[PDB]
From a paper:
Especially, exposure or modification of N-terminal amino acid residues can mediate protein degradation and the resultant proteolytic procedure is called the N-degron pathway (formerly the N-end rule pathway). In multicellular eukaryotes, Nt-Asn and Nt-Gln are deamidated by [name]-encoded NtN-amidase and NTAQ1-encoded NtQ-amidase, respectively. In this study, the crystal structure of [name], the last veiled structure among three amidases in the N-degron pathway, was elucidated.
Although yNta1, NTAQ1, and [name] do appear to share catalytic functions commonly involving a conserved Cys residue critical for the deamidation activity, they exhibit low sequence similarity to each other.
Residue numbers in the entry: 2 to 306
The structure:
């Protein structure tokens, strides 16, 4: 079940009510929202896209920081066992939360040396008070699915939906769009990411075409493993490529007035990828082999094999 200050959470309950009733949650939210955003560079970074999961631990010699950005109505989730340091960062968008929380749980529970030290801690950030209730629904689903687990999960950070909301000109949008977690130090902090590779377009197209949550990183081999992926041709991809920025925002975004400024440019490059690669399974991959990337000496991703 989900625990706050060592006791069970009553669900359903709004995130704001939870935070107001528990001073540790309120202080964490105040401090997190108050941080200035750090521009996290590529060294030791694994950037996790929407509908992806990455897990590793402090003995990883390649990755020291997990991060995700652009959480508009979606939530970034961090589950950490403070004893062995196993740390999973996930960017959930409400596609199938009941399937996705078990994936996060199993990614951490497989690490042993877990009984003698530490505990399971969970952190949830993202979203805002959006007109379509998408963030609030995601918050409820994540809290409920974690609370139905048998193991004790201690809720440490909760900065979602109404807690993550700001207003300008009667227009609401998120405060925190992105966070990083340092796996060695356990720090979780506000962050933005300019270097989101590798295979940024392939991975974005996989999710725009409707792919489910996937785990992208093999901590044992310190290998990023991309694909093989498959999809059918994206409907009306040429038509959407010919629409103007306002039409793309209103129809291809969950919240047209809350997206970050580069949203349309990002989706145009994803649509172009889909247009160029309507059937990637046997054109972008060989013999069903994943594309393999490892960190090089200077902390950048490099393709192997």
């Amino acid at each position: 079940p989900l625990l706050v200050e060592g006791r069970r959470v009553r669900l359903p309950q709004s995130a704001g009510d939870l935070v107001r009733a528990h001073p540790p949650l309120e202080e964490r939210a105040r401090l997190l929202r108050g941080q200035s955003v750090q521009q996290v560079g590529p060294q030791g970074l694994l950037y996790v896209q929407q509908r992806e999961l990455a897990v590793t631990s402090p003995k990883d010699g390649s990755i020291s920081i997990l991060g995700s950005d652009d959480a508009t109505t979606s939530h970034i989730v961090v589950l950490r066992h403070t004893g062995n340091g196993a740390t999973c960062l996930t960017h959930c968008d409400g596609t199938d939360t009941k399937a996705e929380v078990p994936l996060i749980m199993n990614s951490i529970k497989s690490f042993s040396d877990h009984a003698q030290c530490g505990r399971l801690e969970v952190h949830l950030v993202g979203g805002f008070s959006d007109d379509r209730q998408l963030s609030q629904k995601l918050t409820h689903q994540l809290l409920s699915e974690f609370d139905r687990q048998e193991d004790d999960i201690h809720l440490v950070t909760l900065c979602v939906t109404e807690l993550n909301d700001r207003e300008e000109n009667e227009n609401h949008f998120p405060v925190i769009y992105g966070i990083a977690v340092n796996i060695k130090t356990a720090e979780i902090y506000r962050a933005s990411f300019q270097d989101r590779g590798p295979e940024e377009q392939l991975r974005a197209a996989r999710t725009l075409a409707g792919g489910p949550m996937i785990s992208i990183y093999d901590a044992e081999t310190e290998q990023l493993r991309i694909g093989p992926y498959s999809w059918t041709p994206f409907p009306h991809v040429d038509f959407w490529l010919h629409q103007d920025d306002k039409q793309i925002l209103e129809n291809l975004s969950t919240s047209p007035l809350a997206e970050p400024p580069h949203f349309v440019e990002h989706i145009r490059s994803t649509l172009m990828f889909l247009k160029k690669h309507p059937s990637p399974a046997h054109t972008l991959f060989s013999g069903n082999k994943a594309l393999l990337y490892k960190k090089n000496e200077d902390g950048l991703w490099e393709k192997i094999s």
